């Protein structure tokens, strides 16, 4: 049962991160204010 729980955790974690990245990209497209945010798969860069 421990191994099954960890398997499901990995599965949903992976299935979830891609949707999060897509939503983040769509949100970042909203604004172009002076502090510029660059989003990448598995990475985020912040310029201040």
């Amino acid at each position: 049962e421990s191994k099954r729980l960890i398997d499901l955790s990995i599965q949903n974690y992976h299935t979830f991160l891609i949707y999060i990245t897509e939503l983040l990209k769509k949100l970042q497209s909203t604004t172009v204010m002076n502090p510029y945010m660059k989003l990448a798969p598995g990475e985020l860069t912040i310029i201040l």
Binding site: K3, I6, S9, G42, E43, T45, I46, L48
Partner: protein
């Protein structure tokens, strides 16, 4: 006669440096409850700065612990030196921890035969800084899976500053798989451990002791049941 334990401590001052010696041991009728622990540390305060060297080693049936520390202490915020820990456990897995700190870099990692090698390195500088959190697979100590990474960069041109945060889903998934695979590894060692102690003392397994308890329960149940049946005849006859 059954139990003898000795705790010996001594603090000594020798001109320029102090020396701390600690000893502790126990003699027991129990085999896995006897040991000897020892530590030695030489301490020299040179014109206010401290140079530290200490060794702590433990001995026991189920493992032995060996730790080395060296370094110096300038002020309350500058310790430069190395710390190395090595564990030899027949009872469970072994481990080897290495900690390093220089004025411009901190590096440390732990090599576990079950998880692998987990380490982190901090390179610090005025105009840049980088934090690296990596997991090297147990099956591949030659490469580092970046669990996370931080990169601060203050631009020397203009007033801009960059923050770059990076992480690997691969590292997290591999570590999770290693952890879920490690469950039976701990389970078996602990099970054999408890059975080993049961053997050392009464010669029985945990399952053997469970079977003995069940058998004794059955025996006592019959002992009660026979008398419970007999009382009926006793009462009937006396009534007649």
């Amino acid at each position: 006669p059954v139990y003898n334990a000795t705790w010996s401590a001594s603090l000594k001052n020798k001109a320029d440096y102090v020396e701390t010696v600690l000893d502790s041991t126990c003699s027991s009728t129990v085999q896995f409850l006897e040991y000897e622990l020892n530590v030695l540390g030489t301490h020299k305060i040179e014109d206010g700065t401290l140079a530290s060297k200490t060794k702590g080693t433990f001995a026991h049936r189920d493992f032995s612990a060996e730790y080395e520390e060296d370094g110096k202490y300038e002020g309350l915020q500058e310790w430069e030196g190395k710390a190395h820990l090595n564990i030899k456990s027949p009872a469970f897995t072994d481990l080897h921890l290495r900690y390093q700190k220089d004025k411009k870099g901190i590096s440390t990692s732990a090599a576990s035969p079950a998880v692998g090698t987990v380490g982190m390195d901090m390179d610090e500088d005025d105009d840049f800084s980088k934090w690296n959190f990596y997991y090297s697979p147990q099956s591949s100590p030659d490469k580092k899976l970046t669990i996370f990474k931080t990169e601060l960069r203050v631009r020397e041109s203009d007033e801009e500053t960059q923050i770059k945060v990076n992480w690997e889903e691969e590292a997290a998934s591999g570590l999770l798989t290693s952890l879920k695979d490690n469950v039976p590894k701990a389970t078996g060692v602990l099970y054999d451990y408890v059975n080993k102690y049961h053997w050392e003392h009464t010669g029985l397994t945990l399952r053997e002791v469970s079977s003995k308890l069940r058998r004794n329960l059955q025996n006592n149940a019959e002992w009660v049941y026979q008398g419970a049946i007999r009382q009926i005849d006793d009462i009937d006859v006396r009534f007649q």
